[PDB]
Every structure is written in structure tokens, then in C-alpha cells.
Amino acid sequence: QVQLVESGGGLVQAGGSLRLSCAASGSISSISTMGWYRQAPGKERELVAAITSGGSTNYADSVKGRFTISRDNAKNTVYLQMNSLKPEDTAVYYCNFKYYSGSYFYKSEYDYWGKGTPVTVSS
């Protein structure tokens, strides 16, 4: 019933797996893009996975073939199944919802994000 609150993170050893989830604000299909950004202390924000309203997915190089972004319309929830975790994946993960609107005279781009969740992959 709570939204824009990333859950499912924690501490796991290398090779482990986690599954992060985030509920959307209303109809998750009204969304235009859903992404899972991550940032480690001392490092810059980086996009890890991004699904479009059509299902087209994009991934990063380090996470390709390991992390899997996905969506459930019934539960209005975006999912990131992280697998074969490596210590270089330790960071705080944020979920972002991008909404595009416009007409022949204007263009609006809303971005809503959550508080994040920590992921610690131990060596």
C-alpha cells in the first residue's frame, strides 16, 4: 500500500542473489520509463537497468546477463532480480519512474524516485 519505497536489499556474500522491488504511484502502466539507478559512496550515479512502457529493456555492461529488470502490472511493482552478485555491486539502489507528456505546444518530463535501499556484497 506504500509506494516509492525500494525494498529487498541487504547484505549478502559474493555470488549471492537479491530481488529488489518498488511499487509505483497509481497505474504502473501510466509510466513511460522505469529505471534502477545505483550509487556508491565516493562514486557517481549510474543507470543499471531500464524498462520502457512497451517492454524494451536496457542494461549496463557489468550487470548484463546477471541483473534482470521486470514489471508486474497487477501488483503495480517494478522488480530487479540481481544474481551472481560481486563486491563491486555494493551501493545504494534507487528506483526512478519517468513520465512523458506533451502536445503540439509543450513537453513535460516528470521524474519520481524513492529513498533507496543498500546492497552490500561481501568478498
Side-chain angles (χ1 to χ4, degrees):
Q1 206 163 217
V2 59
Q3 307 160 2
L4 297 173
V5 173
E6 298 84 347
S7 67
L11 166 58
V12 73
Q13 204 183 337
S17 307
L18 298 172
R19 199 272 301 270
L20 278 56
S21 77
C22 199
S25 187
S27 189
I28 199 169
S29 64
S30 310
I31 259 111
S32 302
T33 300
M34 287 164 302
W36 282 95
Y37 297 90
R38 73 171 168 193
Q39 187 170 13
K43 299 301 178 181
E44 182 66 303
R45 177 200 66 169
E46 162 201 4
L47 178 58
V48 154
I51 175 181
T52 71
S53 189
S56 178
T57 61
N58 176 81
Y59 291 97
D61 278 7
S62 53
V63 316
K64 209 163 303 177
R66 299 186 311 117
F67 299 179
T68 306
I69 198 171
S70 56
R71 169 215 305 165
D72 185 293
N73 271 358
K75 296 170 295 184
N76 290 338
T77 306
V78 63
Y79 293 101
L80 186 69
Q81 168 79 39
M82 317 179 19
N83 289 325
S84 310
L85 295 182
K86 303 154 149 194
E88 326 158 50
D89 296 325
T90 292
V92 180
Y93 286 62
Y94 297 86
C95 181
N96 173 71
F97 298 87
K98 191 174 287 279
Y99 303 82
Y100 286 115
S101 306
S103 181
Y104 65 98
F105 53 90
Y106 90 101
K107 177 184 165 289
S108 76
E109 176 182 1
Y110 275 84
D111 277 15
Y112 285 81
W113 59 84
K115 267 180 172 176
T117 180
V119 174
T120 311
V121 188
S122 181
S123 301

